[PDB]
Amino acid sequence: NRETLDELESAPQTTRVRADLVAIGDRLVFLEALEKRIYAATNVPYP
Amino acid sequence: DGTGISLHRQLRAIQQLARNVQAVLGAFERGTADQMLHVLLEKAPPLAL
């Protein structure tokens, strides 16, 4: 019966983060390099 | 049967029926746009000709 009222719940708390945002097409996309952030000196292979 | 099954099953078919009417009314609403390409490609000879 064109049911679309499945949920409308929170819109939770938000902050502000330095991230890397570009514009490709009409889709605004992140960018992130994961070498220095999470795999710094960890001796686990980067996938 | 008077139980909750026999009533809810009838509700199942009606909301099933509710989708099919919205389907085939959308069929001719878009089917008109289809036929317009077939009457424009019955005519329209190619540009080099």
PDB file of N, CA and C in Angstrom:
ATOM      1  N   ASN A   1       0.822  -1.200   0.000  1.00  0.00           N
ATOM      2  CA  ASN A   1       0.000   0.000   0.000  1.00  0.00           C
ATOM      3  C   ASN A   1       0.859   1.253   0.000  1.00  0.00           C
ATOM      4  N   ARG A   2       2.044   1.138  -0.601  1.00  0.00           N
ATOM      5  CA  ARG A   2       3.100   2.154  -0.590  1.00  0.00           C
ATOM      6  C   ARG A   2       3.455   2.555   0.843  1.00  0.00           C
ATOM      7  N   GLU A   3       3.895   1.546   1.586  1.00  0.00           N
ATOM      8  CA  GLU A   3       4.351   1.719   2.958  1.00  0.00           C
ATOM      9  C   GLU A   3       5.779   2.248   2.919  1.00  0.00           C
ATOM     10  N   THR A   4       5.991   3.435   3.483  1.00  0.00           N
ATOM     11  CA  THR A   4       7.319   4.021   3.611  1.00  0.00           C
ATOM     12  C   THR A   4       7.574   4.583   5.003  1.00  0.00           C
ATOM     13  N   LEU A   5       6.679   4.316   5.957  1.00  0.00           N
ATOM     14  CA  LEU A   5       6.806   4.872   7.299  1.00  0.00           C
ATOM     15  C   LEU A   5       7.508   3.891   8.231  1.00  0.00           C
ATOM     16  N   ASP A   6       8.532   3.197   7.720  1.00  0.00           N
ATOM     17  CA  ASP A   6       9.249   2.108   8.404  1.00  0.00           C
ATOM     18  C   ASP A   6       9.910   2.665   9.667  1.00  0.00           C
ATOM     19  N   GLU A   7      10.641   3.777   9.591  1.00  0.00           N
ATOM     20  CA  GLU A   7      11.264   4.374  10.766  1.00  0.00           C
ATOM     21  C   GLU A   7      11.580   5.836  10.489  1.00  0.00           C
ATOM     22  N   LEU A   8      11.477   6.663  11.528  1.00  0.00           N
ATOM     23  CA  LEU A   8      12.006   8.025  11.518  1.00  0.00           C
ATOM     24  C   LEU A   8      12.379   8.367  12.949  1.00  0.00           C
ATOM     25  N   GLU A   9      13.656   8.207  13.301  1.00  0.00           N
ATOM     26  CA  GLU A   9      13.959   8.051  14.719  1.00  0.00           C
ATOM     27  C   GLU A   9      14.767   9.158  15.385  1.00  0.00           C
ATOM     28  N   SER A  10      16.014   9.377  14.977  1.00  0.00           N
ATOM     29  CA  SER A  10      16.911  10.070  15.894  1.00  0.00           C
ATOM     30  C   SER A  10      17.470  11.395  15.385  1.00  0.00           C
ATOM     31  N   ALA A  11      18.164  11.405  14.228  1.00  0.00           N
ATOM     32  CA  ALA A  11      19.053  12.477  13.765  1.00  0.00           C
ATOM     33  C   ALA A  11      20.045  12.843  14.866  1.00  0.00           C
ATOM     34  N   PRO A  12      21.046  12.002  15.124  1.00  0.00           N
ATOM     35  CA  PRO A  12      21.792  12.087  16.383  1.00  0.00           C
ATOM     36  C   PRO A  12      22.799  13.226  16.424  1.00  0.00           C
ATOM     37  N   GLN A  13      23.586  13.213  17.499  1.00  0.00           N
ATOM     38  CA  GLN A  13      24.572  14.246  17.771  1.00  0.00           C
ATOM     39  C   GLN A  13      25.699  14.232  16.740  1.00  0.00           C
ATOM     40  N   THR A  14      26.133  15.426  16.337  1.00  0.00           N
ATOM     41  CA  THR A  14      27.107  15.598  15.271  1.00  0.00           C
ATOM     42  C   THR A  14      28.287  16.440  15.744  1.00  0.00           C
ATOM     43  N   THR A  15      29.454  16.200  15.134  1.00  0.00           N
ATOM     44  CA  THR A  15      30.677  16.944  15.426  1.00  0.00           C
ATOM     45  C   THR A  15      31.284  17.466  14.130  1.00  0.00           C
ATOM     46  N   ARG A  16      32.511  17.978  14.223  1.00  0.00           N
ATOM     47  CA  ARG A  16      33.206  18.538  13.068  1.00  0.00           C
ATOM     48  C   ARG A  16      34.614  17.957  12.983  1.00  0.00           C
ATOM     49  N   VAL A  17      34.933  17.335  11.850  1.00  0.00           N
ATOM     50  CA  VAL A  17      36.152  16.551  11.676  1.00  0.00           C
ATOM     51  C   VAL A  17      36.880  17.016  10.421  1.00  0.00           C
ATOM     52  N   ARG A  18      38.189  17.247  10.548  1.00  0.00           N
ATOM     53  CA  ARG A  18      39.049  17.459   9.387  1.00  0.00           C
ATOM     54  C   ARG A  18      39.099  16.180   8.566  1.00  0.00           C
ATOM     55  N   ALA A  19      38.432  16.187   7.421  1.00  0.00           N
ATOM     56  CA  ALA A  19      38.525  15.053   6.519  1.00  0.00           C
ATOM     57  C   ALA A  19      38.883  15.582   5.142  1.00  0.00           C
ATOM     58  N   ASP A  20      38.882  14.729   4.131  1.00  0.00           N
ATOM     59  CA  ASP A  20      39.375  15.130   2.823  1.00  0.00           C
ATOM     60  C   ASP A  20      38.236  14.935   1.835  1.00  0.00           C
ATOM     61  N   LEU A  21      37.597  16.034   1.462  1.00  0.00           N
ATOM     62  CA  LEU A  21      36.385  16.013   0.658  1.00  0.00           C
ATOM     63  C   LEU A  21      36.628  16.661  -0.693  1.00  0.00           C
ATOM     64  N   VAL A  22      36.284  15.940  -1.748  1.00  0.00           N
ATOM     65  CA  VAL A  22      36.358  16.467  -3.098  1.00  0.00           C
ATOM     66  C   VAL A  22      34.996  16.358  -3.746  1.00  0.00           C
ATOM     67  N   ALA A  23      34.912  16.859  -4.970  1.00  0.00           N
ATOM     68  CA  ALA A  23      33.678  16.856  -5.737  1.00  0.00           C
ATOM     69  C   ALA A  23      33.952  16.184  -7.077  1.00  0.00           C
ATOM     70  N   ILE A  24      33.344  15.025  -7.292  1.00  0.00           N
ATOM     71  CA  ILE A  24      33.468  14.285  -8.540  1.00  0.00           C
ATOM     72  C   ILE A  24      32.060  14.061  -9.066  1.00  0.00           C
ATOM     73  N   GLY A  25      31.758  14.662 -10.210  1.00  0.00           N
ATOM     74  CA  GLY A  25      30.415  14.571 -10.748  1.00  0.00           C
ATOM     75  C   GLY A  25      29.481  15.398  -9.897  1.00  0.00           C
ATOM     76  N   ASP A  26      28.309  14.849  -9.603  1.00  0.00           N
ATOM     77  CA  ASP A  26      27.413  15.441  -8.619  1.00  0.00           C
ATOM     78  C   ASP A  26      27.543  14.789  -7.253  1.00  0.00           C
ATOM     79  N   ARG A  27      28.433  13.820  -7.109  1.00  0.00           N
ATOM     80  CA  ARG A  27      28.564  13.062  -5.882  1.00  0.00           C
ATOM     81  C   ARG A  27      29.771  13.560  -5.108  1.00  0.00           C
ATOM     82  N   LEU A  28      29.525  14.082  -3.919  1.00  0.00           N
ATOM     83  CA  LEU A  28      30.598  14.608  -3.098  1.00  0.00           C
ATOM     84  C   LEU A  28      31.144  13.448  -2.282  1.00  0.00           C
ATOM     85  N   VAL A  29      32.446  13.200  -2.388  1.00  0.00           N
ATOM     86  CA  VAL A  29      33.025  11.964  -1.869  1.00  0.00           C
ATOM     87  C   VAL A  29      34.177  12.301  -0.924  1.00  0.00           C
ATOM     88  N   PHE A  30      34.352  11.476   0.113  1.00  0.00           N
ATOM     89  CA  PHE A  30      35.552  11.501   0.945  1.00  0.00           C
ATOM     90  C   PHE A  30      36.803  11.104   0.177  1.00  0.00           C
ATOM     91  N   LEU A  31      37.942  11.275   0.837  1.00  0.00           N
ATOM     92  CA  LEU A  31      39.222  10.676   0.469  1.00  0.00           C
ATOM     93  C   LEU A  31      39.976  10.384   1.759  1.00  0.00           C
ATOM     94  N   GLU A  32      40.647   9.240   1.807  1.00  0.00           N
ATOM     95  CA  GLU A  32      41.436   8.861   2.969  1.00  0.00           C
ATOM     96  C   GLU A  32      42.546   7.917   2.548  1.00  0.00           C
ATOM     97  N   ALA A  33      43.756   8.180   3.020  1.00  0.00           N
ATOM     98  CA  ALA A  33      44.878   7.264   2.882  1.00  0.00           C
ATOM     99  C   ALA A  33      45.069   6.552   4.207  1.00  0.00           C
ATOM    100  N   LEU A  34      45.100   5.231   4.176  1.00  0.00           N
ATOM    101  CA  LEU A  34      45.271   4.481   5.408  1.00  0.00           C
ATOM    102  C   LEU A  34      46.647   3.837   5.375  1.00  0.00           C
ATOM    103  N   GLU A  35      47.670   4.633   5.658  1.00  0.00           N
ATOM    104  CA  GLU A  35      48.983   4.097   5.958  1.00  0.00           C
ATOM    105  C   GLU A  35      49.391   4.652   7.307  1.00  0.00           C
ATOM    106  N   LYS A  36      49.341   5.980   7.419  1.00  0.00           N
ATOM    107  CA  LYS A  36      49.863   6.653   8.600  1.00  0.00           C
ATOM    108  C   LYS A  36      48.823   6.716   9.701  1.00  0.00           C
ATOM    109  N   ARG A  37      47.548   6.579   9.350  1.00  0.00           N
ATOM    110  CA  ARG A  37      46.519   6.713  10.370  1.00  0.00           C
ATOM    111  C   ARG A  37      46.408   5.464  11.216  1.00  0.00           C
ATOM    112  N   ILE A  38      46.170   4.318  10.585  1.00  0.00           N
ATOM    113  CA  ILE A  38      45.781   3.140  11.357  1.00  0.00           C
ATOM    114  C   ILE A  38      46.831   2.051  11.248  1.00  0.00           C
ATOM    115  N   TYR A  39      47.695   2.135  10.245  1.00  0.00           N
ATOM    116  CA  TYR A  39      48.678   1.067  10.047  1.00  0.00           C
ATOM    117  C   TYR A  39      50.095   1.578  10.202  1.00  0.00           C
ATOM    118  N   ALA A  40      50.321   2.448  11.188  1.00  0.00           N
ATOM    119  CA  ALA A  40      51.546   3.234  11.310  1.00  0.00           C
ATOM    120  C   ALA A  40      52.817   2.401  11.428  1.00  0.00           C
ATOM    121  N   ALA A  41      52.962   1.660  12.517  1.00  0.00           N
ATOM    122  CA  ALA A  41      54.091   0.760  12.694  1.00  0.00           C
ATOM    123  C   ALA A  41      53.643  -0.609  13.157  1.00  0.00           C
ATOM    124  N   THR A  42      52.615  -1.160  12.527  1.00  0.00           N
ATOM    125  CA  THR A  42      51.813  -2.205  13.132  1.00  0.00           C
ATOM    126  C   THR A  42      52.222  -3.611  12.729  1.00  0.00           C
ATOM    127  N   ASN A  43      53.083  -3.756  11.723  1.00  0.00           N
ATOM    128  CA  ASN A  43      53.540  -5.014  11.139  1.00  0.00           C
ATOM    129  C   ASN A  43      52.395  -5.904  10.673  1.00  0.00           C
ATOM    130  N   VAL A  44      51.296  -5.333  10.200  1.00  0.00           N
ATOM    131  CA  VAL A  44      50.223  -6.096   9.577  1.00  0.00           C
ATOM    132  C   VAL A  44      50.133  -5.602   8.139  1.00  0.00           C
ATOM    133  N   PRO A  45      49.986  -6.487   7.154  1.00  0.00           N
ATOM    134  CA  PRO A  45      49.961  -6.042   5.758  1.00  0.00           C
ATOM    135  C   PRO A  45      48.727  -5.226   5.427  1.00  0.00           C
ATOM    136  N   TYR A  46      48.969  -4.140   4.716  1.00  0.00           N
ATOM    137  CA  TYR A  46      47.907  -3.269   4.253  1.00  0.00           C
ATOM    138  C   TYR A  46      47.189  -3.929   3.086  1.00  0.00           C
ATOM    139  N   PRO A  47      45.859  -4.011   3.099  1.00  0.00           N
ATOM    140  CA  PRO A  47      45.167  -4.822   2.089  1.00  0.00           C
ATOM    141  C   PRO A  47      45.051  -4.176   0.728  1.00  0.00           C
TER     142      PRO A  47
ATOM    143  N   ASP B   1     -12.972 -17.842   8.614  1.00  0.00           N
ATOM    144  CA  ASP B   1     -13.103 -18.605   9.844  1.00  0.00           C
ATOM    145  C   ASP B   1     -13.425 -17.724  11.035  1.00  0.00           C
ATOM    146  N   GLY B   2     -13.426 -16.405  10.856  1.00  0.00           N
ATOM    147  CA  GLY B   2     -13.574 -15.482  11.953  1.00  0.00           C
ATOM    148  C   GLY B   2     -12.309 -15.202  12.727  1.00  0.00           C
ATOM    149  N   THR B   3     -11.273 -16.021  12.575  1.00  0.00           N
ATOM    150  CA  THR B   3     -10.030 -15.827  13.295  1.00  0.00           C
ATOM    151  C   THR B   3      -9.236 -14.679  12.682  1.00  0.00           C
ATOM    152  N   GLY B   4      -8.116 -14.354  13.326  1.00  0.00           N
ATOM    153  CA  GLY B   4      -7.236 -13.321  12.811  1.00  0.00           C
ATOM    154  C   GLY B   4      -6.553 -13.687  11.514  1.00  0.00           C
ATOM    155  N   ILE B   5      -6.461 -14.980  11.209  1.00  0.00           N
ATOM    156  CA  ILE B   5      -5.869 -15.420   9.956  1.00  0.00           C
ATOM    157  C   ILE B   5      -6.739 -15.012   8.776  1.00  0.00           C
ATOM    158  N   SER B   6      -8.016 -15.396   8.813  1.00  0.00           N
ATOM    159  CA  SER B   6      -8.881 -15.253   7.647  1.00  0.00           C
ATOM    160  C   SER B   6      -9.170 -13.793   7.335  1.00  0.00           C
ATOM    161  N   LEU B   7      -9.060 -12.921   8.331  1.00  0.00           N
ATOM    162  CA  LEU B   7      -9.205 -11.498   8.063  1.00  0.00           C
ATOM    163  C   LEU B   7      -7.916 -10.913   7.512  1.00  0.00           C
ATOM    164  N   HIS B   8      -6.778 -11.302   8.090  1.00  0.00           N
ATOM    165  CA  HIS B   8      -5.508 -10.731   7.652  1.00  0.00           C
ATOM    166  C   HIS B   8      -5.112 -11.237   6.274  1.00  0.00           C
ATOM    167  N   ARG B   9      -5.528 -12.458   5.926  1.00  0.00           N
ATOM    168  CA  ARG B   9      -5.287 -12.964   4.578  1.00  0.00           C
ATOM    169  C   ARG B   9      -6.078 -12.172   3.554  1.00  0.00           C
ATOM    170  N   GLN B  10      -7.267 -11.709   3.933  1.00  0.00           N
ATOM    171  CA  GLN B  10      -8.034 -10.863   3.030  1.00  0.00           C
ATOM    172  C   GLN B  10      -7.374  -9.503   2.893  1.00  0.00           C
ATOM    173  N   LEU B  11      -6.766  -9.021   3.975  1.00  0.00           N
ATOM    174  CA  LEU B  11      -5.972  -7.805   3.881  1.00  0.00           C
ATOM    175  C   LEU B  11      -4.731  -8.018   3.038  1.00  0.00           C
ATOM    176  N   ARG B  12      -4.200  -9.245   3.018  1.00  0.00           N
ATOM    177  CA  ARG B  12      -3.039  -9.548   2.188  1.00  0.00           C
ATOM    178  C   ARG B  12      -3.351  -9.394   0.709  1.00  0.00           C
ATOM    179  N   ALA B  13      -4.512  -9.876   0.273  1.00  0.00           N
ATOM    180  CA  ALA B  13      -4.848  -9.839  -1.143  1.00  0.00           C
ATOM    181  C   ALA B  13      -5.192  -8.432  -1.610  1.00  0.00           C
ATOM    182  N   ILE B  14      -5.793  -7.621  -0.736  1.00  0.00           N
ATOM    183  CA  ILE B  14      -6.211  -6.279  -1.130  1.00  0.00           C
ATOM    184  C   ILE B  14      -5.003  -5.378  -1.335  1.00  0.00           C
ATOM    185  N   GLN B  15      -4.038  -5.446  -0.426  1.00  0.00           N
ATOM    186  CA  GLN B  15      -2.821  -4.666  -0.596  1.00  0.00           C
ATOM    187  C   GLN B  15      -1.930  -5.259  -1.683  1.00  0.00           C
ATOM    188  N   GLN B  16      -2.087  -6.553  -1.970  1.00  0.00           N
ATOM    189  CA  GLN B  16      -1.550  -7.106  -3.206  1.00  0.00           C
ATOM    190  C   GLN B  16      -2.239  -6.522  -4.427  1.00  0.00           C
ATOM    191  N   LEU B  17      -3.571  -6.442  -4.399  1.00  0.00           N
ATOM    192  CA  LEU B  17      -4.335  -5.851  -5.493  1.00  0.00           C
ATOM    193  C   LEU B  17      -4.007  -4.376  -5.653  1.00  0.00           C
ATOM    194  N   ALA B  18      -3.701  -3.706  -4.537  1.00  0.00           N
ATOM    195  CA  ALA B  18      -3.387  -2.282  -4.560  1.00  0.00           C
ATOM    196  C   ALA B  18      -2.113  -1.995  -5.344  1.00  0.00           C
ATOM    197  N   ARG B  19      -1.206  -2.969  -5.418  1.00  0.00           N
ATOM    198  CA  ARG B  19       0.023  -2.756  -6.170  1.00  0.00           C
ATOM    199  C   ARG B  19      -0.200  -2.939  -7.664  1.00  0.00           C
ATOM    200  N   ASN B  20      -1.085  -3.868  -8.039  1.00  0.00           N
ATOM    201  CA  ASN B  20      -1.261  -4.178  -9.455  1.00  0.00           C
ATOM    202  C   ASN B  20      -2.001  -3.069 -10.187  1.00  0.00           C
ATOM    203  N   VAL B  21      -2.930  -2.401  -9.507  1.00  0.00           N
ATOM    204  CA  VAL B  21      -3.627  -1.272 -10.113  1.00  0.00           C
ATOM    205  C   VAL B  21      -2.669  -0.112 -10.308  1.00  0.00           C
ATOM    206  N   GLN B  22      -1.793   0.118  -9.332  1.00  0.00           N
ATOM    207  CA  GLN B  22      -0.777   1.150  -9.488  1.00  0.00           C
ATOM    208  C   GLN B  22       0.269   0.744 -10.512  1.00  0.00           C
ATOM    209  N   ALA B  23       0.413  -0.556 -10.759  1.00  0.00           N
ATOM    210  CA  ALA B  23       1.339  -1.008 -11.786  1.00  0.00           C
ATOM    211  C   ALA B  23       0.809  -0.705 -13.181  1.00  0.00           C
ATOM    212  N   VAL B  24      -0.366  -1.236 -13.524  1.00  0.00           N
ATOM    213  CA  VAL B  24      -0.829  -1.126 -14.900  1.00  0.00           C
ATOM    214  C   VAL B  24      -1.313   0.272 -15.252  1.00  0.00           C
ATOM    215  N   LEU B  25      -1.672   1.099 -14.271  1.00  0.00           N
ATOM    216  CA  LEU B  25      -1.883   2.504 -14.590  1.00  0.00           C
ATOM    217  C   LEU B  25      -0.577   3.192 -14.925  1.00  0.00           C
ATOM    218  N   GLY B  26       0.520   2.762 -14.305  1.00  0.00           N
ATOM    219  CA  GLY B  26       1.818   3.241 -14.729  1.00  0.00           C
ATOM    220  C   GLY B  26       2.265   2.669 -16.052  1.00  0.00           C
ATOM    221  N   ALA B  27       1.693   1.533 -16.457  1.00  0.00           N
ATOM    222  CA  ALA B  27       2.083   0.908 -17.716  1.00  0.00           C
ATOM    223  C   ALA B  27       1.678   1.768 -18.903  1.00  0.00           C
ATOM    224  N   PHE B  28       0.408   2.156 -18.973  1.00  0.00           N
ATOM    225  CA  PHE B  28      -0.022   3.022 -20.060  1.00  0.00           C
ATOM    226  C   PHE B  28       0.467   4.449 -19.896  1.00  0.00           C
ATOM    227  N   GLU B  29       0.782   4.873 -18.672  1.00  0.00           N
ATOM    228  CA  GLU B  29       1.328   6.209 -18.473  1.00  0.00           C
ATOM    229  C   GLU B  29       2.730   6.317 -19.047  1.00  0.00           C
ATOM    230  N   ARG B  30       3.482   5.219 -19.040  1.00  0.00           N
ATOM    231  CA  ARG B  30       4.781   5.211 -19.695  1.00  0.00           C
ATOM    232  C   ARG B  30       4.710   4.600 -21.081  1.00  0.00           C
ATOM    233  N   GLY B  31       3.685   3.788 -21.345  1.00  0.00           N
ATOM    234  CA  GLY B  31       3.594   3.121 -22.632  1.00  0.00           C
ATOM    235  C   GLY B  31       3.324   4.083 -23.766  1.00  0.00           C
ATOM    236  N   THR B  32       2.747   5.239 -23.448  1.00  0.00           N
ATOM    237  CA  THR B  32       2.550   6.275 -24.450  1.00  0.00           C
ATOM    238  C   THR B  32       3.888   6.812 -24.937  1.00  0.00           C
ATOM    239  N   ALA B  33       4.842   6.972 -24.017  1.00  0.00           N
ATOM    240  CA  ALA B  33       6.172   7.454 -24.381  1.00  0.00           C
ATOM    241  C   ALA B  33       6.905   6.443 -25.252  1.00  0.00           C
ATOM    242  N   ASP B  34       6.582   5.159 -25.084  1.00  0.00           N
ATOM    243  CA  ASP B  34       7.207   4.130 -25.902  1.00  0.00           C
ATOM    244  C   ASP B  34       6.749   4.211 -27.344  1.00  0.00           C
ATOM    245  N   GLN B  35       5.444   4.320 -27.554  1.00  0.00           N
ATOM    246  CA  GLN B  35       4.869   4.376 -28.888  1.00  0.00           C
ATOM    247  C   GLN B  35       5.331   5.598 -29.671  1.00  0.00           C
ATOM    248  N   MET B  36       5.668   6.693 -28.987  1.00  0.00           N
ATOM    249  CA  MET B  36       6.098   7.895 -29.689  1.00  0.00           C
ATOM    250  C   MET B  36       7.458   7.696 -30.343  1.00  0.00           C
ATOM    251  N   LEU B  37       8.289   6.826 -29.773  1.00  0.00           N
ATOM    252  CA  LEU B  37       9.539   6.505 -30.444  1.00  0.00           C
ATOM    253  C   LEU B  37       9.293   5.608 -31.644  1.00  0.00           C
ATOM    254  N   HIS B  38       8.254   4.779 -31.581  1.00  0.00           N
ATOM    255  CA  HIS B  38       7.986   3.904 -32.711  1.00  0.00           C
ATOM    256  C   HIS B  38       7.277   4.630 -33.841  1.00  0.00           C
ATOM    257  N   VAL B  39       6.636   5.764 -33.559  1.00  0.00           N
ATOM    258  CA  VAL B  39       6.097   6.537 -34.673  1.00  0.00           C
ATOM    259  C   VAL B  39       7.126   7.529 -35.183  1.00  0.00           C
ATOM    260  N   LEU B  40       8.157   7.819 -34.401  1.00  0.00           N
ATOM    261  CA  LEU B  40       9.212   8.669 -34.924  1.00  0.00           C
ATOM    262  C   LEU B  40      10.301   7.861 -35.599  1.00  0.00           C
ATOM    263  N   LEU B  41      10.348   6.561 -35.357  1.00  0.00           N
ATOM    264  CA  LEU B  41      11.280   5.734 -36.105  1.00  0.00           C
ATOM    265  C   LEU B  41      10.599   4.965 -37.222  1.00  0.00           C
ATOM    266  N   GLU B  42       9.276   5.048 -37.332  1.00  0.00           N
ATOM    267  CA  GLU B  42       8.631   4.636 -38.569  1.00  0.00           C
ATOM    268  C   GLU B  42       8.977   5.608 -39.685  1.00  0.00           C
ATOM    269  N   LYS B  43       8.945   6.903 -39.382  1.00  0.00           N
ATOM    270  CA  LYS B  43       9.568   7.930 -40.202  1.00  0.00           C
ATOM    271  C   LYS B  43      10.985   8.160 -39.694  1.00  0.00           C
ATOM    272  N   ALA B  44      11.578   9.323 -40.013  1.00  0.00           N
ATOM    273  CA  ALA B  44      12.972   9.726 -39.791  1.00  0.00           C
ATOM    274  C   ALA B  44      13.992   8.883 -40.547  1.00  0.00           C
ATOM    275  N   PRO B  45      14.152   9.104 -41.849  1.00  0.00           N
ATOM    276  CA  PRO B  45      15.266   8.500 -42.584  1.00  0.00           C
ATOM    277  C   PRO B  45      16.603   8.999 -42.068  1.00  0.00           C
ATOM    278  N   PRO B  46      17.678   8.230 -42.265  1.00  0.00           N
ATOM    279  CA  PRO B  46      18.982   8.611 -41.711  1.00  0.00           C
ATOM    280  C   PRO B  46      19.545   9.882 -42.322  1.00  0.00           C
ATOM    281  N   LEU B  47      20.434  10.523 -41.561  1.00  0.00           N
ATOM    282  CA  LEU B  47      20.863  11.883 -41.867  1.00  0.00           C
ATOM    283  C   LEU B  47      21.733  11.929 -43.111  1.00  0.00           C
ATOM    284  N   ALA B  48      22.551  10.897 -43.319  1.00  0.00           N
ATOM    285  CA  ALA B  48      23.393  10.854 -44.506  1.00  0.00           C
ATOM    286  C   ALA B  48      22.565  10.602 -45.751  1.00  0.00           C
ATOM    287  N   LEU B  49      21.361  10.073 -45.580  1.00  0.00           N
ATOM    288  CA  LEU B  49      20.488   9.904 -46.723  1.00  0.00           C
ATOM    289  C   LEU B  49      19.500  11.056 -46.834  1.00  0.00           C
TER     290      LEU B  49
END
